[PDB]
């Protein structure tokens, strides 16, 4: 086959049941996370590829970069709560990795600051427990799925992307393999 099982994707042993039907998983400590979204923008191509009616979900993961990832994982859920992701990716990428300028959750903060969220309601958010839902949320995913490493796609919980094999040359080549791989196994 053109797409084979064990090859540019891998189908989950213990299929996750009512899972987003595109997830991605990432940490903005991630090196390959950076460039994945910043350089090759897999996840903006991967959306343009998809069909009608599937969505897409990107969570934030705890286990690198010790306290601060777990932070931002906090305040990827505040960037969720407010709909400001496409605000605040680019800066907390470049202050983790760029600038190292991020070093502390007030740092954290000073990104959406920039980005024109009021203090008060990053605040409100920070402090809510619907943002405490939405960092629930995004440690059961990666439970579930038993996630040990990023960047990670998975489709309708059932298959893992595997970028791994695929020829790198060419970043727009690799980057429309993908999201073809990830419409694929959309229609499995």
Request: glycine share 6%; with cysteine.
């Amino acid at each position: 086959a053109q797409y084979e099982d064990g090859k540019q994707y891998t189908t989950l042993e213990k299929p996750v049941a009512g899972a987003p039907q595109v997830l991605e998983f990432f940490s903005f400590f991630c090196p390959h996370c950076y460039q994945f979204e910043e350089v090759l923008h897999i996840s903006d191509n991967v959306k343009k590829k998809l069909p009608e009616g599937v969505k897409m979900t990107k969570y934030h993961v705890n286990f690198m970069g010790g306290d601060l990832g777990k932070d931002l994982t906090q305040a990827w859920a505040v960037a969720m709560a407010l709909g400001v992701e496409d605000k605040v990716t680019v800066p907390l990428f470049e202050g983790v990795q760029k600038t190292q300028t991020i070093r502390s959750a007030s740092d954290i903060r000073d990104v959406f600051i920039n980005a024109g969220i009021k203090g008060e309601e990053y605040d409100a958010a920070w402090n809510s427990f619907v943002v405490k839902s939405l960092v629930a949320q995004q440690e059961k995913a990666a439970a579930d799925v038993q996630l040990r490493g990023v960047p990670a796609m998975f489709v309708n919980g059932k298959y893992q992307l595997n970028p791994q094999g695929m020829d790198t040359s060419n970043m727009d080549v690799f980057v429309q393999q993908y999201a073809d791989t990830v419409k694929y196994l959309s229609e499995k």
